């Protein structure tokens, strides 16, 4: 009787721990996906910003050359 109680309580606890481990795995997977998406976002932004400052630098240099010519 006490053995049946121990077995039932242990099986219930193992079921709940399985539920918790599946929840933790799902949460870690979602966090991994989001962190990696934000990392790709930051890297894309850094690349585009480098291109844009390249463009701005080229344009500003052309403008400064034109001003040096005019004045």
């Amino acid at each position: 009787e006490n053995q049946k109680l121990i077995a039932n309580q242990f099986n219930s606890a193992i079921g709940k721990i399985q539920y918790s481990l599946s929840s933790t795995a799902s949460a870690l997977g979602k966090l991994q996906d989001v962190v990696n998406q934000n990392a790709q976002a930051l890297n894309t932004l850094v690349k585009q910003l480098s291109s844009n400052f390249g463009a701005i630098s080229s344009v500003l240099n052309d403008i400064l050359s034109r001003l040096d010519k005019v004045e």
Partner: protein, 37 residues
Amino acid sequence: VDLGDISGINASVVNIQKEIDRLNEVAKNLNESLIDL
């Protein structure tokens, strides 16, 4: 002069509140699995 458009770069948000709630629910329910001989 056409600067590149960066407005499409979006950062996702995570919603693991269901899983945190399940974890806390299990940490509370495991008291119903304690053995009282």
